[PDB]
Structure formats: structure tokens, C-alpha cells
Amino acid sequence: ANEVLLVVGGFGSQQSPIDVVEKYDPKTQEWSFLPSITRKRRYVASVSLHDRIYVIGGYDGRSRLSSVECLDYGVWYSVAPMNVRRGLAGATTLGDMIYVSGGFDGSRRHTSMERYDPNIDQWSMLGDMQTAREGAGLVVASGVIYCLGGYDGLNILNSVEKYDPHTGHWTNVTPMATKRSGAGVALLNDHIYVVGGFDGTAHLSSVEAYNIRTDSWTTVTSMTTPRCYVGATVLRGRLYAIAGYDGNSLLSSIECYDPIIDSWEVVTSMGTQRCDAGVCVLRE
């Protein structure tokens, strides 16, 4: 068994959306290049479902994209597009379907969430959030979907919402201490970790952890550097922060969170500097 890191698209060195796809193997501690996605995509999302990498939404420098494309872990091909053009949307997996909420279509931010079923190749609309959010994070915790942070066109948000499938509505939970947009969101053990982001004035290195059991927020040792629009994932039980913008330059860094000694250390760096790129973890 081995778990690989995948980084797709984003905003590159040359101040442009990019199509680059990189793979990190921790066993070899080595980076590899994969076939590039068919379209340059910044503000993009990415998920893993049945050994498939899904690149969702984004912004190609001209339009924000309905299109979604897939790679079987190789060749990249398009699948059924979303009902909404979504840039900077939250994406996650639940059961064996893909959930994508929020985003920006070029004129309005979205309360919508939708669901991709691969067995019928379909995107289905579901219940709307209370607040439209772009740059918000999506995660699954105890079989329930959480969407955190973002930006509604007016203020940066500390609001966190949770989805109730039995009613089709979202209910608010205890908000985060710091309003964050472009923060990385992941689930590690019994805590939802939110890393970095932007609070309206400063680029954040702060990290918060929400306890699934107690429903309470805590502050954690902050990352080695400020990161906004940084990827966050869990690989073989360790939390990883991926690239991002440090307030002045794009980042190559990938850093790991050590829970036993409670510290962050940069573990590796990619061949490209990216922010708001899609991140996913795939099991080999």
C-alpha cells in the first residue's frame, strides 16, 4: 500500500493559469510529471474517486469553467460538466459521489452545491448554503459535509456551514476564530484542520482545529510560512500543506504537520510554484 500526492493546475510562475500535473511519491520522496490537463486552470479543484483524478471547475484566464475532466491512474478526458461555472469552489467525496459547493462564475458567488454520480455521469443540484462563498473549503466529517470560510463579495468569512441531507438545507456551526478565504481544509483524526488563508488584511500562517467530538475550535502551531490558496490533504495519516501564496511570491514548498512533537517542517518542493491549485491523494 502507498499513497501519492497529486497537484493539478493553478497559478504559475509566469503569472498565468497553468496545466501542469505533478505527483509526489513519499516512498521515493520524489516528484514526477504526468500528462498535462487539456485546459489551463487556476482557481481549480481536484478530487480522487475510484482511482480517478477529477479536475473540477477553475478559471482559464478568460472564463470560469463548467468543464470537469478525469484521468484514470494515462490520458485526460472530459466528463459531464457541472450545472454552474465554478471558480474557487470546495470539492470533496462522500459515499461514491463528488460534492462541489460554492465558487464564483465571473459575476456572482454561489450558495449552490451539486453532486456528481459517476455511474450515470450526472451533476445534480442540491440544497443551497445560507451564504454564498468563493474560496471556501469542503471536507467530510462523520459522514456530514462541512464548508468553511470563503468570501461573499463583501466580507471575508469565518462562517462554517454543515449540510443536512434529510432536509436539503445547511445549518450553521461554531465559526472559526479567524475569517479565512483561500484556506486549506482537511480532516485529520478527530479534528478538521484549517490552514492558512487570507483574513482581509494579512496572509495567514495560523491553523485551527475543530474537534468532531466536542464541536469546539482550537488554535494549533502555525505553519512555517504564511500560505493562502494552499492545498491541504492527509497522506498516510500526516497532514500536508501544499504550495500557496506567502504574501509576496508563489510557493514551491510542501510541509508536513507532526502531531506527536506538534511542529511543522518543510518536507519537499515541486518543480513549479503554484497557488490555488487542485490537490488530491490517491491510493496505489
Binding site: 497559478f11 503569472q15 498565468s16 474560496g135 468570501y151 483561500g182 488563508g197 493562502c228 504574501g247 497557488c275
Partner: peptide, 7 residues
């Protein structure tokens, strides 16, 4: 969106 660089 927040602090994301623009093009």
C-alpha cells in the same frame, strides 16, 4: 477573492 494574485 482575497490575497490571490491577479492577471
Amino acid at each position: 477573492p482575497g490575497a490571490p494574485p491577479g492577471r
